Amino acid sequence: ATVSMRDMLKAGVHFGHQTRYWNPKMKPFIFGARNKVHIINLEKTVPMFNEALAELNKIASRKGKILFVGTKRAASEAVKDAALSCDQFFVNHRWLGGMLTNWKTVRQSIKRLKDLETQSQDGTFDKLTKKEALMRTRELEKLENSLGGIKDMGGLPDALFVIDADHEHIAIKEANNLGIPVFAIVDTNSDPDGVDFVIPGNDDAIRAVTLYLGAVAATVREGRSQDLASQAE
């Protein structure tokens, strides 16, 4: 969990956005301006990322629930696979507004969702109508899109790992209102004050995003190793 200071360099973590869209608070992690862009300071970046990795690893050891948030369509797909690979659930694209807090109300939603899935191999064959059938399928699809990937949890998650943060400013606000710790791949235009582990990367290109996902994924497997057995053969 100590990704070479050079691997990210080729990944694209160094290229931010332009000044026209630059959070002035991010100054501590600046290196200059290539073609008037803003090149993140990787040397400043890297200790924080590896530190959060260790933090998230001790979490998974205490068996604290982790979570990830979907972003752009490419990001969402990538997030899903990494999550499913291990555990720690996953959001998809919308975050279903006030999921945290209205977690009891969305819990009833999850209940209804699972029942429908169960009754999707039951109610479908019997009493099927050219009208009701379409109703069932369509509603399930919508519910699944976002609610799917969280339905498993059956409770309040103990951590969150979003991407970019700015695109999900809503998610950080709710997480701050409960104590649930978070991690965010802040970019040159993202308010990081609410984050407890500022990862100054770049939510772009996916390539680099896949690096961050792969990284954390590995740390939570170390947590599972403490939850299963040590390396041997």
């Binding site: 200071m5 050079r6 360099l9 160094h14 290196f31 290539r34 090149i39 300071n41 990787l42 040397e43």
Partner: peptide
Amino acid sequence: TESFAQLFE
């Protein structure tokens, strides 16, 4: 490790 400036150059 090589300096960031030289690497970016």
